């Protein structure tokens, strides 16, 4: 389907409401490594069982939570190319699974957000570097720092101070422990811009203050529930107050070389200097390699999913095309 549009009303409003209830998981139902997602499938803004189309995602992430529309585009279709189905147009919030349909070739993975490498990355907050044998539940000793870095750096709220803090300690602990640690290009990006997210979209909308309570905090991150009379944010956002976590601490992107602390910066990697190679990386490298001769029909469906995400991509960047025209 065509991606949708921006919401024709984003105001504030309650989206834990009687259309979208929180209910448990029940035996199959796949939730991955984002709270975001698993949230809205947990309320039925997406399908229950964490199975869902780009447009579905698109859909949800606006409607429940105020995502803003070029960052849901561009996500969304970033996630799909690399993770989802291209020819069942579904995509996993979670692990891999059969009900995405049947699978391209090798070296396709369609793995879900689960996949290691594609999206998912190191150094996230509430979950384990994928070295550590689990990259998508729920960590409680990881969320209990944030508790922690939120009682230091936030007054006991989570808010862009604590991100810029908290940020740093994770790409710290990982370089320190995670001999495959990576941390460049799309993962460099999307790494920074996920700590602004709880500041941003899980702060009821009628404050918008950027102070994340820990209940609320916990309710997303470890039950993929809404608070009780949750209001969405009261206008379209995603990754603003990103600048304040990056200050912080600026980092290079790089690895670790096959050690702990051998972090070497990759001058090849993009970086916030250079987004619109992250893009151009992203399809001539990533998604190609994925699918580097794909037939008519994968061909056709890589083509306009690539014309899907290049919506998303900020204003200036040239569009590349991996399989032509
Ligand atoms: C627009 C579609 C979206 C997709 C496909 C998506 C997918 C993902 C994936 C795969 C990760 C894993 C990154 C990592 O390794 O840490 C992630 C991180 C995260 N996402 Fe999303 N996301 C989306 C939008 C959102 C939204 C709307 C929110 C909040 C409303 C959100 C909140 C988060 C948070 C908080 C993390 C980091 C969690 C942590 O580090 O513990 N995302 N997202
Ligand atoms: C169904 C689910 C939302 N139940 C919530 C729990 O009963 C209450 O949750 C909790 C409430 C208060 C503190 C906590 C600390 C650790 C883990 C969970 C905590
Ligand atoms: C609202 C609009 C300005 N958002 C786009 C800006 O680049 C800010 O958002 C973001 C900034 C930096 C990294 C990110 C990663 C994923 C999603 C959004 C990100
Ligand atoms: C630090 C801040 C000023 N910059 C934020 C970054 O420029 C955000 O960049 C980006 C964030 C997320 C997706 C993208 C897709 C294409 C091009 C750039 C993207
Ligand atoms: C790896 C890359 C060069 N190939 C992508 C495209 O297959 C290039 O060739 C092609 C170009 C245009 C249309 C086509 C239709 C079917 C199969 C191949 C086509
Ligand atoms: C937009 O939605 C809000 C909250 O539901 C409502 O109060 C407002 O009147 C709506 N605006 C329009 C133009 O429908
Ligand atoms: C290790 O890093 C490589 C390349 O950077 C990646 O392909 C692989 O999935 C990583 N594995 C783990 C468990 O981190
Ligand atoms: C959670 O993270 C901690 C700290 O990195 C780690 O030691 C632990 O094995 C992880 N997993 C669980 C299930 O606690
Ligand atoms: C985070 O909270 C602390 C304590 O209230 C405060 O000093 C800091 O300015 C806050 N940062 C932001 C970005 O709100
Ligand atoms: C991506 O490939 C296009 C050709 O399709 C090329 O013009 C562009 O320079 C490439 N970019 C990178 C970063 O490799
Ligand atoms: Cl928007
Ligand atoms: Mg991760």
Not at 58 to 72: K, M, P, T
Not at 157 to 175: C, H, M, P, W
Not at 241 to 269: F, L
Request: proline share 8%; aromatic share 12%.
């Amino acid at each position: 389907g065509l991606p949708p549009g921006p919401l024709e009303n984003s105001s504030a409003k309650l989206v834990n409401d009687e259309a979208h209830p929180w209910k448990p998981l029940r035996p199959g139902d796949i939730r991955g490594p984002c709270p975001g997602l698993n949230t809205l499938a947990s309320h039925g803004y997406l399908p229950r069982n964490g199975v869902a189309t780009p447009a579905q995602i698109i859909n949800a992430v606006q409607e429940g939570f105020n995502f803003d529309n070029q960052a849901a585009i561009f996500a969304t279709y970033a996630a799909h190319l690399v993770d989802g189905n291209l020819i069942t147009d579904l995509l996993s919030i979670g692990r891999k699974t059969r009900l995405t349909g049947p699978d391209p070739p090798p070296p396709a993975s369609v793995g879900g957000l689960n996949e290691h490498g594609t999206f998912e990355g190191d150094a996230s907050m509430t979950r384990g570097d994928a070295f550590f044998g689990n990259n998508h539940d729920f960590n409680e000793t990881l969320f209990e720092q944030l508790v922690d870095y939120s009682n230091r750096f936030g007054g006991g709220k989570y808010n862009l101070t604590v991100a810029g803090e908290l940020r740093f300690k994770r790409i710290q602990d990982s370089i320190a422990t995670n001999p495959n640690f990576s941390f460049v290009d799309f993962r460099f990006f999307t790494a920074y811009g996920e700590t602004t997210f709880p500041a941003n979209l899980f702060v009821d909308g009628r404050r918008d203050d950027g102070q994340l309570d820990m209940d609320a905090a916990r309710s997303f991150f470890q039950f993929s529930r809404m608070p009780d009379d949750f209001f969405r944010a009261p206008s379209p956002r995603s990754g603003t107050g990103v600048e304040v976590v990056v200050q912080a601490h600026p980092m290079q992107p790089g690895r670790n070389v096959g050690k702990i602390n051998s972090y070497t910066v990759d001058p090849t990697s993009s970086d916030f200097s250079t987004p619109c190679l992250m893009y151009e990386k992203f399809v001539n490298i990533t998604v190609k390699s994925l699918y580097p001769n794909p037939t008519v029909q994968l061909r056709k469906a890589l083509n306009t999913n690539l014309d899907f995400l290049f919506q998303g991509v900020a204003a200036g960047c040239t569009q590349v095309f991996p399989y032509g025209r």
